[PDB]
């Protein structure tokens, strides 16, 4: 219930969990609070204290605005922050097996949430069902969200860039430091995390701060060369600058103008993020990753593509309908309350709403690769083929490309195609597997009986754990007891892959194939 760590002593709680015990610390610090003149700043490091810190309830979230588009509705009101919002907000969660492990290899969690929203307190992100059934130590922390976190002066140490993902980093410095008071093992430190989350993770592969921080990696749903994830250093200095302009803080010299960005109350910078672009799309990511020359050093998409990468085993994949949730957020005709049935014109809008910066011939593109039918005359092709458009361009085809570039350059990589619609799924039909519908699975909430998810769902979660904890602890996300199907490699010649589902899991080789070679190699031209 007490552990030492190297900045004081802090108490944590006994969870029941299955007739087990798990023993949680829930809003640890991490670092010093970035607030008033740390605003803006690279996170500091943590002062030591003397008391015993009470690690008894998860830490306020960081600021951030509030998906207010369904209020009352569990399917997107399961994804704001159950917290209080603050600025103090650099704390993580430990969940240790009890017995206290001996060398327990560690499984670090980063959400996602577009850069801009997200915590770790959610209860889809909850460790304690991992800690119990595959005795890892669950870690997660809070890292700054929106121009909290990633507000981009570059060269400017008062408004760096990345200061998110920084935070991200001296949490993971934490868990070296640690940990083994913990009873986990420093060298054994799998990073997981889901959309933003995982273009996260796929960062911190690049970014030589991290190399030595962690051994493998687990991209859910995203990658840094996914369209949404990596700001240009133009748009940043403009989109700072816009920033500025709204909230009156213009001024010639740079730091001033950070300065006066300091004495703004956050809900005065909040409000004014959504238009520092001109247009925006629902999958806006108005402040996130810049190269900033210390954290990312280059062009990531350059990193790739000559091998400059930390060299390990990673585990990608990616949900069967990726984009279907975005499209309730301004498509037109699109709603969770009706099937969506859209014409050819509406699905022309949707278009202009998710590629409003494009030429009219890169739209018609779209269109023609996307509207042969196998069949004119089903009226759900213009409505299936807007979610397929937004889900291959944002999420698959980036998610398959990188795991391609990766794997060239000799390490193993595993990719899985997950493609069960949760019988507890809040959204409508029509939107099927949904983006962050397998964290559940993953995390195993499934495996509690008492919470109405069916028997398959549980075997299929099970097996998912196990999977995801022998990829973190052996390096190969094998189930090797009960029979299962053996995932294969993914090879750039091969490109084979695993289905996870409640029927038959399936090796399938070269996932979307005719998309990708149109969003990959035709459509970055335009
Ligand atoms: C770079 O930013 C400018 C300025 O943006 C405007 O001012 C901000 C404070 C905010 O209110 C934005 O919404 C404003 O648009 C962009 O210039 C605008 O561009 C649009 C269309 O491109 C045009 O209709 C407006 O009149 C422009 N406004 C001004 C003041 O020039 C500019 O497009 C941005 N650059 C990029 C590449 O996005
Ligand atoms: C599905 O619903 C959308 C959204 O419309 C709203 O939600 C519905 C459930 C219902 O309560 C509507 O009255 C609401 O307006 C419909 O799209 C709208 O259609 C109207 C028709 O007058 C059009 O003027 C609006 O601009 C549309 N709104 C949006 C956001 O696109 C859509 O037609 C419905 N589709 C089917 C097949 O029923
Ligand atoms: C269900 C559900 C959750 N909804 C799914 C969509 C919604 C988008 N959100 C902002 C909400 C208001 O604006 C549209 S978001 O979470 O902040 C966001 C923003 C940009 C992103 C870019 C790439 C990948 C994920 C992103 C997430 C939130
Ligand atoms: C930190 O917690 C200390 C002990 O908390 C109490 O005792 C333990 C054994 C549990 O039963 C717990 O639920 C109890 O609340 C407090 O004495 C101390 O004041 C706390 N420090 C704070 C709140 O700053
Ligand atoms: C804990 O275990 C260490 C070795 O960890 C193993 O080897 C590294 C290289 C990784 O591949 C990791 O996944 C493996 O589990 C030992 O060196 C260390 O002494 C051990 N310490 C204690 C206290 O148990
Ligand atoms: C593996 O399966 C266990 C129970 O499955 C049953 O018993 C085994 C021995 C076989 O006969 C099997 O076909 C039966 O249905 C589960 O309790 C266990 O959690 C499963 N483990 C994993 C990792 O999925
Ligand atoms: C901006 O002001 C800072 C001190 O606040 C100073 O170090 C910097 O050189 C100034 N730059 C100008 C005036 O261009
Ligand atoms: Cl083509």
Not at 369 to 394: F, K, M, S
Not at 517 to 522: G, L
């Amino acid at each position: 219930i007490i552990i030492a760590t190297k900045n004081g002593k802090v108490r944590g709680m006994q969870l029941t969990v299955f007739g087990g015990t798990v023993t949680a610390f829930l809003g640890i610090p991490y670092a010093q609070p970035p607030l008033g003149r740390l605003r803006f700043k690279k996170p500091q490091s943590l002062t030591k204290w003397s008391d015993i810190w009470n690690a008894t309830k998860y830490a306020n979230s960081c600021c951030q605005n509030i998906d207010q588009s369904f209020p009352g509705f569990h399917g997107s009101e399961m994804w704001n922050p159950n917290t209080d919002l603050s600025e103090d907000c650099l704390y993580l969660n430990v969940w240790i097996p009890a017995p206290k492990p001996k060398n327990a290899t560690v499984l670090i969690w980063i959400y996602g949430g577009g850069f801009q929203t997200g915590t770790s307190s959610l209860h889809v992100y909850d460790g304690k069902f991992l800690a119990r059934v595959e005795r890892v130590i669950v870690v997660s922390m809070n890292y700054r969200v929106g121009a909290l976190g990633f507000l981009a002066l570059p060269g400017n140490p008062e408004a760096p860039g990345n200061m998110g993902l920084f935070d991200q980093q001296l949490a993971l410095q934490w868990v070296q430091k640690n940990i083994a008071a913990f009873g986990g093992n420093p060298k054994s430190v799998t990073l997981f995390g889901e959309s933003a989350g995982a273009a996260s993770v796929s960062l911190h592969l690049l970014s030589p701060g991290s190399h030595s921080l962690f051994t493998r990696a687990i991209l859910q749903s995203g990658s840094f060369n996914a369209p949404w994830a990596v700001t240009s250093l133009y748009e940043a200095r403009n989109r700072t600058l816009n920033l500025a302009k709204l909230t009156g803080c213009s001024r010639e010299n740079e730091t001033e103008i950070i300065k006066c960005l300091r004495n703004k109350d956050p809900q005065e910078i909040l409000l004014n993020e959504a238009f520092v672009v001109p247009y925006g799309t629902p999958l806006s990511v108005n402040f996130g990753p810049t190269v900033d020359g210390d954290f990312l050093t280059d062009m990531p998409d350059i990193l790739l593509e000559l091998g400059q990468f930390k060299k390990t085993q990673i585990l990608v994949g990616v949900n069967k309908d990726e984009g279907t949730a975005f499209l309730v957020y301004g498509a037109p005709g699109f709603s969770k309350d009706n099937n969506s049935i859209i014409t050819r014109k509406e699905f022309q809008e949707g278009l202009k709403i998710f590629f409003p910066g494009v030429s009219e011939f890169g739209k018609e593109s779209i269109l023609f690769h996307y509207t042969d039918w196998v069949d004119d005359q089903r009226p759900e092709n213009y409505r299936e083929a807007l979610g397929d458009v937004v889900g291959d361009y944002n999420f698959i085809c980036p998610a398959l490309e990188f795991t391609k570039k990766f794997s060239e350059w000799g390490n193993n990589a595993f990719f899985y195609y997950f493609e069960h619609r949760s019988s507890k799924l809040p959204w409508p039909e029509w939107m099927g597997v949904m983006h962050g519908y397998e964290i559940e699975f993953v995390f195993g909430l499934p495996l509690e009986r008492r919470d109405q998810y069916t028997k398959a769902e549980e075997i299929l979660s099970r097996s998912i754990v196990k999977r995801w904890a022998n990829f973190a602890k052996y390096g190969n996300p094998q189930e090797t007891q009960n029979q299962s199907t053996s995932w294969p490699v993914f090879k750039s010649t091969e490109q084979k892959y695993l289905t996870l589902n409640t029927e038959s899991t399936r090796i399938m080789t070269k996932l979307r194939a005719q998309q990708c070679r149109f969003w990959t190699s035709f459509f970055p031209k335009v």
